[PDB]
Design a protein around this ligand. Structure first.
Ligand SMILES: CCCCCCCCCCCCCCCCCC(=O)OC[C@H](COP(=O)([O-])OCC[N+](C)(C)C)OC(=O)CCCCCCCCCCCCCCCCC
Ligand SMILES: CCCCCCCCCCCCCCCCCC(=O)OC[C@H](COP(=O)(O)OCCN)OC(=O)CCCCCCCCCCCCCCCCC
Ligand SMILES: CCCCCCCCCCCCCCCCCC(=O)OC[C@H](COP(=O)(O)OCCN)OC(=O)CCCCCCCCCCCCCCCCC
Ligand SMILES: CCCCCCCCCCCCCCCCCC(=O)OC[C@H](COP(=O)(O)OCCN)OC(=O)CCCCCCCCCCCCCCCCC
Ligand SMILES: CCCCCCCCCCCCO[C@@H]1O[C@H](CO)[C@@H](O[C@H]2O[C@H](CO)[C@@H](O)[C@H](O)[C@H]2O)[C@H](O)[C@H]1O
Ligand SMILES: CCCCCCCCCCCCO[C@@H]1O[C@H](CO)[C@@H](O[C@H]2O[C@H](CO)[C@@H](O)[C@H](O)[C@H]2O)[C@H](O)[C@H]1O
Ligand SMILES: CCCCCCCCCCCCO[C@@H]1O[C@H](CO)[C@@H](O[C@H]2O[C@H](CO)[C@@H](O)[C@H](O)[C@H]2O)[C@H](O)[C@H]1O
Ligand SMILES: CCCCCCCCCCCCO[C@@H]1O[C@H](CO)[C@@H](O[C@H]2O[C@H](CO)[C@@H](O)[C@H](O)[C@H]2O)[C@H](O)[C@H]1O
Ligand SMILES: CCCCCCCCCCCCO[C@@H]1O[C@H](CO)[C@@H](O[C@H]2O[C@H](CO)[C@@H](O)[C@H](O)[C@H]2O)[C@H](O)[C@H]1O
Ligand SMILES: CCCCCCCCCCCCO[C@@H]1O[C@H](CO)[C@@H](O[C@H]2O[C@H](CO)[C@@H](O)[C@H](O)[C@H]2O)[C@H](O)[C@H]1O
Lengths: 318, 345, 105, 171, 115, 172, 48, 98, 83
């Protein structure tokens, strides 16, 4: 009965990941005054499945200069960590209930940067090495602020358990007492997931395709499934943390439906953002995060350390 | 470096040993060893050239490896006894690994090959710091556990250090190496007497510090690194020859100078414990120190090496060095034997 | 210490968490708190050299609680002697050792 | 070296309180204010004695009062009580705050039927004093005698005889 | 055990898709197909040569700030102490020296990439 | 599940054996991540949680930087892998043979003292407050803000000084 | 509102902890007996 | 616990062998100094957890704090060694024999 | 006193991130000093009962230690209910 419960997590997520590729191509379409896919199936609904099938019948590439062990490991790691980020998410009851879920999300997210690094390095190509060394630069940019932002929000929550955020937001979104951190949190998630205007590791304009330039076929498909799963998860995580869905102990179906509506809406804003802005320069990404966000995040960390103290609003341990 | 950096870096250099010396817990003693290791590194490599970079690198990898070994002892001991201090019941092998690691940090032979080279690649004032102030932290740990130390390991290290320091210094024309090997030999004396009378290790350290400080200050007066550079002192700072010579004889343990007192009292206390053979070899190889100290005295105060034309300009100019500390340390380091009973106890 | 400054100033920078029986957060005793508290009180004031012999009883008990060498030895011997009997066929464990007890409460 | 003394399996037999945690938690506040004296003596025995074998009588009086307490509810307020803990059981942390409506009905049964008042907030966590005729243990750790201190040396300081006595130095 | 099961299931899917990708397609290998990509011309040198890091100082400053996260992450447990004045004072100082350290590096052109 | 901790410590051992043979720092940084992850799982098995995830978090950011430095300063044309050189490949294989030998040997001459293969699992958790509430390693680590505030002063100062230390070391 | 809701949660936690305190005597009595029987049952098998 | 410390302690020895037996890169010797920190941290963490000594759990964190500083200071030096000879090979650091 | 206003207006125009950062940093150090609630933070943490309140033996000279928890003596959390 637990195996059936994995099915009803990993399969709906994978289906939802695929259609995000369709929603991306049609929202980008209509925002660009065109229609996006709409021939492959009714309104393109079969277009995601065509792309998947075609990619797994495409010849896979084994470049002569490549380090095969890491070349193969990297896409496999990418998609594993994308699916593993989901098992602790409470919706409103998580598949795996962890006391330090927030750290499991932080630690799993960091380890997924090594799929970019190892793949790029293992390709033994100049454009793939440029892409990898932007993954290093991008992580050094957003890592420090992203952890501290979480610390600030969790001092109103009382613990690193994700399931306790449901109870913190019983009467109010954390977005209100924390909208400065949500603004900084949201931009971090665009950097965490290599999403425009921060698609610097890929960055088709400057690097031909960045880290995955030497990847074709099914191995390259796994990288994308990982990229789009993370988009849903990071916005799903942002919905739990800051936009707490309605939770009634008698209507757990209500929390999921409301959780989905806000997660879909936030996922759309990622697609909305990609259609609206030019791409950052990856040196300027560091300056954004270290010279703007970091000074503000440290101050808000000190604000939220003191805030429960001088209002006697310390969250409970349990 | 700007004043903020100096204040931060020089405070940290001072802070380290004070943390190691004032700490009851072993992990805080280790922390102080880390502060000294980290903060000295920018000082050593300040001139930034190929030689100081190698010196600061050899120093880092040596002292970091020794740090990890010390930490293993501190942690294996916490496993064995659930406490953060060494006890009479601490495993024997735990103590020996601490000793070898600390000697690696002091420069005691046979773990000594790094010290002469590091001292060679760095400026004189940082050699002074490295050969003096930086020795107090590892030594203060050792004096806190002297009831526990295995004397066989300590005496083999001391005998080795006295021999290697003598033989090494005999072949050196670079003054900074002569000071490093001088240090290695003296650490042999401090360590040989450690498990018997730790107070005599502090006497031998203090007398060594007040002899080694003015000696560096004397070389820092004209920035003289070689035996030929120091040979020009008669035509540069001839007023310095009277006290350079005594300090060198004093470093050599010759009577009736203060530097005879440490060797003499250590030998006396070693033979109170029946340590006859070790004591005899130690005193017999200390004679070799006096030979290459004598050779330096020959080149500087008891003869006049050829001088060059451009040194005449040097004489027209006026020096503002040395300071009042050089004279105070020169006299106390040579003319204080008649106060011996007030120094030992 | 080498410079008993903490003792002189009467402060405690690191003296208060030296050993197991020290104060713990939320009054949670450490494993072998009873034994260690005995050993430290036995060897208090008599000095290290006297304590090594005159508090050997307290220490060997604390050492046994902390590392449990004899306990593992003893439970190794009981299980190994039972292994031998069961191979021969002269002993079948009770129901409450084979996974069929009537649980308490 | 000694033989650990263990009670025989029939010294450890009592009537068990075989009810689920939600049943205990629903009745926890009233029970704390009803079986308090019996409960407070067992804990005193346990912390004073530091031995479970020495309190196998006070601990069977704990089970004595816990069962009596439940028999009083199984004879006055069975249904108000059963609606309450059955609703407390649903939550995954068994939180009181999801059953304030059933809780009220069970309180308004024990109060009128049995006179039981629920302790306020903070009252169950107080440190109370318990009166008992059990003797106070004097050596609870079974410690030996502490070894003697090194005898002190009496007298006033006098100058060291003939000074430092260091080789040929006179003073 | 569940958390071990769900992750093997994740790994086996990633493995299973990896095997299908390599043994299902029809593959035609020749040297000119498997050479590295460089916009249509031959590479002029291997990609394993040194690649200067213009942000190296920020990289090692990330390490120092990374460990200063490890010191702030116990705070959610620390605001449960009776010694609230102490907890708060230590927290304020810790964040303030991280900020003072950051300001010094910022003013020393330390955040600027080496040209 | 009785061999669980023994296997994790055996994997940890190899990760440091591979690390000690020192292939290209690209792979040496890969061993530290897997040993860091394995070691994280050990601290979890023994009941830790915060300490397990922190050492995993910290070593994830350290190897990110180390990777950036390898591609810039410690990279040669033909990076060495554990199979690259027959001599290293010999000592990695041989190294695993020795542990299978040392464990089997030392298990033969004491049976309990060091390695007690007969009793793996029986001696993992010694005691545990079964009715406890405040026992997470986070509470113990959090004592730096109240009880062992001295730990945090030296730790904070260590990092504070380090910024000044590195800016001067790397200065032109 | 966070303040007023965290203060309410502090009272809720105190109620939930006082419930545990009201019951620890019963668990402690049971822990002793449960542990003593298990030790007695190994003793009756070591003898055999 | 007995079997774990033996494997952990031998893990520390292998890294001490790695540190003491140089090859070409100085960066590889730096990673062995991190293998040692990781072994010591895991030993201390397991010791403190097994003995239930919560007051010692600050100490494993300080080891990580004071181990990063070395890794930072070690990497800073590795930059100066590379800016001189263009690699980090140890065999280049030998000017000081004379 | 006159030039500062010019500077602060200047920074506020072109560097609000730092002007916001210093203000929030400095406002967080004042608020505990002046709030009339900072004292309860310790009290509420002290009023949360994790460990068992081990009872003390009643010798007979304990006239301010409750016998039963529902006694009118002992620490009271009324200030917390009505907080
Ligand atoms: C999903 C894909 C699994 C089925 C195809 C496996 C390919 C394979 O290994 O063929 C058997 C192999 C041949 O592998 P293969 O090289 O022909 O694999 C290519 C697959 N096709 C034919 C579709 C292009 O048989 C053997 O000779 C060895 C066994
Ligand atoms: C690459 C492979 C994917 C790597 C995944 C990395 C992320 C895993 C982080 C570690 C998970 C963790 O933090 O453990 C949490 C959990 C402990 O549970 P706890 O937090 O205490 O709360 C309930 C206790 N009552 O832990 C547990 O419940 C038990 C420990 C589970 C450990 C999970 C290990 C993942 C599988 C790795 C297989 C090897 C990959 C090859
Ligand atoms: C225990 C202490 C061990 C000695 C450690 C040495 C500390 C001094 C560090 C140093 O840099 O020494 C050189 C110092 C610089 O002074 P100076 O030579 O006059 O040149 C610059 C002044 N304008 O010159 C000095 O003043 C050195 C004085 C040494 C004092 C030793 C006291 C014993
Ligand atoms: C220049 C060229 C000449 C070189 C001379 C070399 C001198 C070597 C001195 C060696 C040490 C011998 C003197 C130390 C000594 O033992 O004197 C002890 C002295 C005792 O006092 P005193 O009055 O002299 O006689 C006893 C009555 N109190 O009390 C003292 O300690 C006085 C110490 C100062 C000695 C002058
Ligand atoms: C040596 C120990 C005794 C001193 C104790 C410590 C207190 C020192 C007080 C004097 C401080 C002077 O230190 C001051 O440092 C700053 C940086 O911080 C230097 O300023 C530096 O940074 C500023 C930033 O705007 C830029 O102009 C430039 O990059 C550089 O000049 C100043 O040039 C120096 O005047
Ligand atoms: C509680 C805090 C304790 C603080 C302790 C402070 C200890 C005292 C430190 C003294 C340091 C000054 O000592 C040092 O002097 C030497 C000269 O000898 C200078 O060193 C100089 O060497 C040569 C020539 O001498 C020059 O080419 C070089 O550029 C210059 O650095 C250093 O720039 C200065 O730093
Ligand atoms: C070098 C870096 C330095 C920069 C950082 C400086 C930070 C300094 C912060 C000072 C703020 C301390 O603020 C101080 O908070 C404590 C508790 O929180 C308050 O203390 C009050 O509350 C506590 C509990 O909370 C009560 O037990 C106490 O009796 C009462 O006085 C003080 O009234 C207030 O002055
Ligand atoms: C990265 C490589 C990792 C591989 C690590 C090695 C994995 C295998 C673990 C080997 C450890 C010993 O593994 C197993 O331990 C059990 C108990 O724990 C030993 O002992 C077992 O058998 C003995 C009799 O011999 C009985 O007392 C009992 O059934 C049990 O104790 C087994 O004889 C051994 O097979
Ligand atoms: C010159 C360089 C050094 C200057 C910088 C360092 C200044 C010192 C700042 C750190 C201060 C630590 O301050 C020290 O805190 C500890 C606990 O934290 C207190 O110590 C306390 O510990 C625990 C608290 O639960 C009690 O059991 C113990 O009895 C009590 O002494 C000391 O009374 C206080 O002196
Ligand atoms: C015995 C089985 C147990 C495990 C054994 C492995 C333990 C870990 C050892 C790590 C050190 C390896 O030891 C190794 O020694 C060799 C010499 O033999 C040296 O290596 C040097 O010489 C060898 C031999 O030509 C070359 O292949 C190598 O490229 C060169 O760097 C290095 O100093 C170190 O890399």
């Amino acid at each position: 009965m637990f195996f059936i419960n994995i099915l009803t997590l990993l399969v709906p997520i994978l289906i939802a990941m695929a259609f995000l590729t369709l929603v991306e191509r049609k929202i980008l379409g209509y925002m660009q005054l065109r229609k996006g896919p709409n021939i492959v199936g009714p309104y393109g609904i079969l277009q995601p499945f065509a792309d998947a099938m075609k990619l797994f019948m495409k010849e896979p590439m084994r470049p002569l200069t490549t380090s095969m062990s890491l070349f193969i490991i990297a896409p496999t790691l990418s998609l594993t960590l994308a699916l593993s980020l989901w098992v602790p998410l409470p919706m409103p009851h998580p598949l795996i209930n962890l006391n330090l879920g927030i750290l499991f999300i932080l630690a799993t997210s960091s380890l997924s940067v090594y799929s970019i690094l190892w793949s790029g390095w293992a390709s033994n190509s100049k454009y793939s090495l440029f892409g990898a060394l932007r993954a290093v630069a991008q992580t050094i940019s957003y890592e420090v602020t992203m952890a501290i932002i979480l610390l600030s929000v969790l001092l109103m929550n009382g613990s690193y358990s994700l399931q306790t955020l449901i109870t913190t937001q019983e009467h109010m979104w954390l977005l209100l007492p924390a909208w400065p951190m949500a603004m900084m949190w949201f931009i971090s998630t665009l950097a965490e997931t290599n999403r425009a205007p921060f698609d610097l590791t890929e960055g088709e304009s400057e690097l031909v395709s960045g880290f995955n330039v030497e990847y074709a076929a099914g191995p390259f498909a796994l990288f994308f499934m990982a990229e789009y799963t993370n988009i849903i998860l990071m916005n799903a995580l942002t919905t739990i943390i800051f936009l707490g869905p309605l939770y009634y102990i008698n209507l757990p179906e209500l929390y999921s439906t409301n959780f989905m509506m806000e997660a879909l809406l936030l996922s759309s804003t990622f697609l909305w953002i990609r259609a609206s802005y030019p791409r950052f320069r990856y040196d300027q990404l560091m300056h954004l995060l270290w010279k703007n966000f970091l000074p503000l995040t440290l101050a808000l960390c000190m604000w939220h350390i003191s805030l429960p103290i001088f209002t006697a609003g310390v969250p409970p341990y349990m | 470096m700007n004043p903020i950096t100096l204040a931060i870096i020089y405070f940290t250099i001072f802070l380290g040993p004070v943390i190691t010396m004032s700490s009851t817990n072993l992990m805080l003693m280790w922390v102080g060893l880390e502060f000294s290791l980290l903060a000295i590194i920018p000082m050593l490599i300040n001139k930034k050239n190929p030689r100081s970079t190698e010196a600061a690198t050899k120093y880092f990898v040596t002292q970091a490896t020794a740090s990890m070994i010390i930490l293993l002892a501190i942690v294996l001991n916490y496993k064995q006894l659930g406490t953060w201090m060494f006890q009479q019941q601490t495993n024997g092998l735990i103590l020996n690994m601490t000793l070898m690691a600390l000697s690696m940090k002091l420069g005691l032979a046979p773990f000594h090959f790094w010290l002469p080279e590091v001292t060679q690649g760095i400026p004189l004032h940082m050699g002074l710091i490295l050969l003096t102030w930086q020795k107090i932290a590892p030594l203060s740990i050792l004096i806190q556990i002297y009831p526990l130390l295995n004397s066989t390991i300590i005496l083999m290290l001391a005998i080795t250090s006295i021999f290697m320091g003598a033989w090494g210094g005999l072949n050196q024309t670079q003054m900074r190496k002569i000071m490093a090997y001088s240090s290695i030999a003296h650490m042999g004396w401090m360590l040989a007497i450690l498990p018997y009378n730790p107070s005599l290790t502090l006497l031998n350290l203090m007398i060594y510090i007040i002899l080694t400080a003015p000696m560096f200050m004397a070389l820092m007066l004209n920035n003289s690194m070689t035996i030929n550079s120091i040979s020009l002192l008669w035509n540069k700072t001839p007023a310095m020859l009277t006290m350079i010579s005594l300090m060198l004889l004093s470093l050599g343990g010759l009577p009736p100078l203060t530097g005879f007192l440490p060797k003499w009292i250590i030998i006396t206390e070693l033979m109170k414990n029946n340590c006859l053979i070790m004591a005899t070899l130690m005193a017999m190889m200390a004679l070799l120190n006096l030979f290459f100290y004598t050779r330096l005295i020959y080149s500087t105060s008891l003869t006049m090496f050829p001088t060059n034309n451009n040194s005449k300009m040097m004489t027209h100019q006026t020096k503002t060095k040395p300071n009042l500390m050089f004279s105070t340390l020169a006299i106390m380091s040579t003319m204080t034997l008649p106060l011996a009973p007030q120094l030992i106890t | 210490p080498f410079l008993d400054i903490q003792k002189k100033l009467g402060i405690s920078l690191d003296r208060h968490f030296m050993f197991l029986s020290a104060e713990q957060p939320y009054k949670n005793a450490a494993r072998c708190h009873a034994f260690e508290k005995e050993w430290i009180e036995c060897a208090h004031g008599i000095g290290g050299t006297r304590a090594k012999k005159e508090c050997k009883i307290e220490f060997d008990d604390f050492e046994e609680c902390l590392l449990r060498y004899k306990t593992m030895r003893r439970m190794h011997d009981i299980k190994k002697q039972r292994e031998k009997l069961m191979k021969e066929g002269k002993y079948t464990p009770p129901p409450h050792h084979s996974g069929r007890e009537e649980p308490r409460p | 070296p000694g033989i650990v003394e263990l009670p025989t399996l029939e010294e450890l037999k009592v009537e068990e309180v075989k009810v689920s945690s939600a049943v205990l938690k629903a009745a926890a506040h009233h029970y704390g204010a009803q079986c308090d004296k019996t409960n407070k003596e067992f804990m005193l025995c346990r912390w004073e004695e530091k031995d479970p074998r020495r309190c196998l009588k006070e601990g069977k009086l704990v089970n004595g009062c816990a069962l009596n307490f439940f028999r009083q509810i199984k004879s006055h307020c069975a249904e108000p009580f059963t609606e309450y803990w059955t609703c407390l059981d649903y939550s995954n942390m068994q939180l009181f705050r999801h059953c304030r409506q059933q809780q009220a009905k069970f309180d308004q049964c024990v109060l009128d039927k049995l006179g039981w008042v629920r302790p306020d907030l903070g009252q169950l966590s107080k440190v109370t004093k318990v009166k008992t005729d059990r003797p106070l243990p004097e050596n609870p750790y079974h410690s030996r005698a502490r070894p003697e201190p090194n005898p002190v040396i009496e007298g006033d300081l006098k100058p060291a005889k003939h000074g430092t006595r260091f080789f040929f130095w006179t003073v | 055990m569940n958390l071990y099961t769900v992750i093997f299931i994740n790994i086996l899917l990633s493995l299973t898709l990896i095997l299908v990708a390599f043994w299902l397609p029809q593959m035609n290998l020749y040297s000119e197909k498997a050479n590295p990509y460089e916009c249509g011309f031959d590479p002029t040198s291997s990609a394993r040569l040194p690649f200067s890091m213009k942000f190296f100082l920020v990289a090692i400053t990330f390490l120092l700030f990374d460990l200063e996260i490890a010191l702030l992450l116990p705070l959610p447990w620390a605001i449960q102490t009776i010694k609230t004045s102490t907890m708060m004072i230590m927290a304020f100082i810790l964040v303030t020296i991280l900020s003072l350290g950051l300001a010094y590096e910022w003013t020393q052109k330390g955040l600027e990439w080496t040209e | 599940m009785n061999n669980y901790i023994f296997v994790l410590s055996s994997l940890f051992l190899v990760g440091c054996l591979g690390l000690a043979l020192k292939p290209s720092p690209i792979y040496g940084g890969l061993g530290l991540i897997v040993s860091g992850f394995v070691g994280c799982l050990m601290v979890l098995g023994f009941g830790g949680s915060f300490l397990g995830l922190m050492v995993f978090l910290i070593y994830l950011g350290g190897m990110l930087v180390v990777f950036g430095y390898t591609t810039a300063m410690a990279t040669e044309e033909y990076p060495e892998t554990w199979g690259s050189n027959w001599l290293i490949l010999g000592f990695l294989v041989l190294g695993v043979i020795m542990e299978v030998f040392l464990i089997c040997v030392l298990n033969y001459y004491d049976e309990v003292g060091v390695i007690n293969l007969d009793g793996l699992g029986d001696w993992l958790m010694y005691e545990v407050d079964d009715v406890g509430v405040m026992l997470e390693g986070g509470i113990g680590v959090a004592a730096m803000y109240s009880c062992a505030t001295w730990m945090m002063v030296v730790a904070g100062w260590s990092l504070f000084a380090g910024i000044f230390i590195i800016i001067e070391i790397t200065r032109d | 509102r966070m303040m007023r809701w965290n203060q309410e949660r502090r009272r809720l936690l105190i109620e939930d902890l006082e419930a545990r305190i009201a019951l620890m005597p019963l668990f402690q009595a049971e822990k002793d007996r449960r542990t003593l029987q298990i030790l007695r049952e190994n003793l009756e098998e070591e003898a055999i | 616990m007995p079997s774990t410390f033996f494997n952990l302690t031998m893990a520390f020895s292998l890294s001490l062998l790695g540190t003491l037996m140089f090859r070409s890169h100085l960066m590889s010797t730096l990673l062995c100094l991190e293998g040692m920190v990781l072994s010591l941290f895991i030993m201390t963490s397991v010791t403190s957890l097994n003995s239930n000594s919560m007051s010692s759990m600050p100490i494993p964190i300080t080891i990580l704090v004071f181990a990063a500083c070395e890794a930072a200071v070690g990497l800073a030096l590795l930059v100066k060694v590379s800016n001189t000879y263009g690699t980090d090979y140890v065999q280049n650091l030998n000017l000081l024999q004379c | 006193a006159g030039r500062i206003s010019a500077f602060l207006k200047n920074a506020w125009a072109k560097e609000p991130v730092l002007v916001v950062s210093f203000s929030v940093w400095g406002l967080a150090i004042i608020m505990p000093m002046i709030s009339p609630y900072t004292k309860y933070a310790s009290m509420i943490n002290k009023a949360t009962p994790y460990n068992y309140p081990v009872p003390v033996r009643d010798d007979g000279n304990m006239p301010d230690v409750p016998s039963h928890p529902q006694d009118p003596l002992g620490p009271s959390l009324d200030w917390l209910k009505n907080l």
